[PDB]
Design a protein around this ligand. Sequence first.
Ligand SMILES: Nc1nc2c(ncn2[C@@H]2O[C@H](COP(=O)(O)OP(=O)(O)O)[C@@H](O)[C@H]2O)c(=O)[nH]1
Ligand SMILES: [Zn+2]
Length: 269
Amino acid sequence: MKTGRIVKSISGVYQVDVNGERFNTKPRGLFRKKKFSPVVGDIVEFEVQNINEGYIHQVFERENELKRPPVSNIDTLVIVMSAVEPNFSTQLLDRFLVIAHSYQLNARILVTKKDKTPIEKQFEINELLKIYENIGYETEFIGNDDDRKKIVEAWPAGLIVLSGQSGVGKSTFLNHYRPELHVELFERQNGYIADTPGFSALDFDHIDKDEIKDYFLELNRYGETCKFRNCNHIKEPNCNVKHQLEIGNIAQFRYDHYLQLFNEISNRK
Ligand SMILES: Nc1nc2c(ncn2[C@@H]2O[C@H](COP(=O)(O)OP(=O)(O)O)[C@@H](O)[C@H]2O)c(=O)[nH]1
Ligand SMILES: [Zn+2]
């Protein structure tokens, strides 16, 4: 009877947004069981009752999902990094992109605190952000002089989830969408933006050492012409990644972070 996105879950009641319209609903069939329980971000078919209430009959197949917090069908993961306080880190950024792609997410890169970054440092970060744009990511570098609402409404349509450490500047964006002014979705013009971040932790537990190269997008792309179909680009001969490194089309820090994570993600915790 109606199709929409779950924007709130409160003690087994699922609020479903239907183009602005809100419905408090409960699951039936499979969706009453824990192994099929609805999550915020689910697209659902529900039966309308009592004007603004309803029963969820179908939860559509999840295109993607985070477990902590539990949220499904993210259209863009915005990785939020400070330029300073703390200092921008390609080591932390590469790790967040690996996690992002391991969850099958679209990712883009947002650097904050430009207005208090030394201008010489701004040029070094700008050159780093160029390397990520050559890999295929959209990047922005913003400060207090920038319109945070204009920025969010230029983002691709659908569900945006901000992921990054506390203090990087997620709330400064999110407060523009808080009606009051465990995960809830807030409306924006072309979709939603999420209450919570996506990660930071031992979201490495599910990753096989063999998958790490798939989530370095330029290694994955250049590995197409390595001799070996599963070349790890470490000791293998005829390696196209090590060649592209040599002639300067893969950045050394990217290769070095791949190597550290390949060596680390193997290890017992
Ligand atoms: N100067 C400056 N400070 C910022 C910027 N973005 C965030 N902050 C500050 O950094 C701190 C953390 O911001 P907040 O949005 O609460 O971070 P969250 O923990 O990631 O949500 C706060 O004191 C913010 O006002 C920025 O672009 N420039
Ligand atoms: Zn290779």
